[PDB]
Amino acid sequence: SAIKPDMKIKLRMEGNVNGHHFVIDGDGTGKPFEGKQSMDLEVKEGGPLPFAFDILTTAFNRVFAKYPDNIQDYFKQSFPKGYSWERSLTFEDGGICNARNDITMEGDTFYNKVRFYGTNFPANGPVMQKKTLKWEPATEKMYVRDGVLTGDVETALLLEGNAHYRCDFRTTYKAKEKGVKLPGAHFVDHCIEILSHDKDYNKVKLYEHAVAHSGLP
């Protein structure tokens, strides 16, 4: 196996939300076979961000997911060459984001070239007013559409004041090597948490745990 039980993560994101430009760098570690990762993020340009940091976090690698032997693990099988993904995010009030990640591996480290573009967020809405608290835990449904591995998530952000702000997202995933075999349909349960942050979210520590399963006990 190319993938070690302990791996480092290096990341750069560039993006633009509602016209606001930003650059965020990330440094982290994780355990591919246990489905756990954590990382320190730092805003390098455009800070303090004028929108809810939480909209970014799912863009900050399905290699970090515990797969049982009975499900084909497309992500681990994509290395060393790597893979990329593209995601569209649709929010209940018309906010739309497109994000992509190109993931490579050199030695013990995954490098991530992330781009994130968001538009059409209402100025009075929870994103531009910074009213979000967290993503609720979510299940990603994995299946093949027109020969492309596709994951769908229907989820929500919890807001201040006991309200939820719904978001649907679709991600398509493509190995760089031709001939990595596609898996059968399955599910991946996710939990993502901001562990700590400073005053305006210029520095954030982020954690994710993810487990693949076939839907039964």
Please list the residues that pair with 178 across neighbouring strands: none
Q: What is the resolution of this structure in A?
A: 1.8
Question: Domain locations in the chain?
Answer: 1-217
Count CB-CB contacts under 10 A for residue 213: 16
Output the six-digit token pair for 83.
């893979």
- Residue 129 gets the label, from left (phi > 0), alpha (psi -120 to 50) or beta, of alpha
Dist CA 116 CA 185 (whole Å): 27
- What's the N-to-C CA distance of the chain in angstroms? 29
Dist CA 109 CA 140 (whole Å): 25
Q: What's the burial of 7, exposed, middle or buried (CB within 10 Å: 0-12/13-18/19+)?
A: buried
Evaluate whether 41 touches 26 at the Cβ level (below 8 Å): yes
CA 190 to chain centre: 10
- Give the phi and the psi of residue 48 in degrees, each rounded to 5: -70, 140
Instruction: Give the position of tokens 């399905």.
Output: 62
Task: Tell me which residue of 18, 27, 49 sits closest to 198, measured CA to CA.
Answer: 49
The per-residue DSSP string of the chain comes to --S-SSEEEEEEEEEEETTEEEEEEEEEEEETTTTEEEEEEEEEESPSPSS-GGGGTTT--TTSSB--TTS--TTGGGTTT-EEEEEEEEETTS-EEEEEEEEEEETTEEEEEEEEEEE---TTSTTTTT-EEEEPPEEEEEEEETTEEEEEEEEEEEETTTEEEEEEEEEEEEESSTTPPPPPSEEEEEEEEEEEE-TTSSEEEEEEEEEEE-S--
Alpha-carbon torsion, ordered 204, 82, 148, 96, to 10 deg: 30
Q: What's the burial of 68, exposed, middle or buried (CB within 10 Å: 0-12/13-18/19+)?
A: exposed
Q: Note the residue count of the chain.
A: 217
